[model samples]
Target: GSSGSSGEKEDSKTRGEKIKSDFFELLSNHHLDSQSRWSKVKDKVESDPRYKAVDSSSMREDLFKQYIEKIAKNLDSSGPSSG
Candidate 1:
């Protein structure tokens, strides 16, 4: 009998933190506004050796979106549930 104890689910919270940290760490070094910060984050993440191997810029964007959403949700308690 197989024990249904598979721990295959990824920890979204941890992943989100890593993405947020990396994004902000880069942002802190630049003197960009919010809009420019986002653009720079996307560009830096794409060009960075650590993140470049992830491939698919869209995927990276999606992950970044998730991180933002999580933070937003935390800020707005009346917000909808996180998907």
Candidate 2:
């Protein structure tokens, strides 16, 4: 019986991912669009718990941009298809 390899430090990392995803969900619920400004949405979402999920304001805005870009890309893909 010689085994002592039990360690985990990724808890914070995984939590961060979930928090960021939740923040994205929050933004989505608010129908944030690519035409929207972070400053504007910031005021709206600030009242949401997910808004503070990511302690860093920078990361919050970055994720917001990512969400907007994702939405923009989706809009582009929804173009009229000849099919």
Candidate 3:
């Protein structure tokens, strides 16, 4: 028997997908707009029950940053998670 292949790390998502699709709408409707600041996003993320699982801490800093960028980029459009 000869086998050399094995699995590797899987820390990142398949795509640049965020946990929530309509997070922008949720922001505008519940808290702030995508064009707003990151402070508001952190507030909603930390205070809201629906977002309780999405930690806004240093552990997920890059992911959160990417999410924020996506929102800002796709603020004027809506699709099936096309961003």
Residue pairs clashing in model 2 are none
Q: What residue runs in model 1 are displaced by over 4 Å at the alpha carbon?
A: 1-6, 9-37, 75-83
lDDT, each prediction? 0.53, 0.75, 0.51
Writing each residue's lDDT as its tens digit, candidate 3 over 1-83 gives: 13243654335653113444434345546544456556766676656654554444552455455556666684645577575
lDDT of 3 at 82: 72
Can you rank all candidates by lDDT, best first? Answer: 2, 1, 3
Candidate 2: stretches off by over 4 Å:
1-14, 74-83
The global Cα lDDT (0 to 1) of model 3 is 0.51
- For model 1, residues 1-83, the per-residue Cα lDDT tens digits are 12254544448643544554565455445443434445767676556665644444665666555555555453545556665
Candidate 1 vs candidate 3: the lDDT winner is 1
Ranking, TM-score, top scorer first = 2, 1, 3
Quote the lDDT for 5 in model 3: 36
Every model's Cα RMSD, please?
Answer: 9.9, 9.1, 9.9
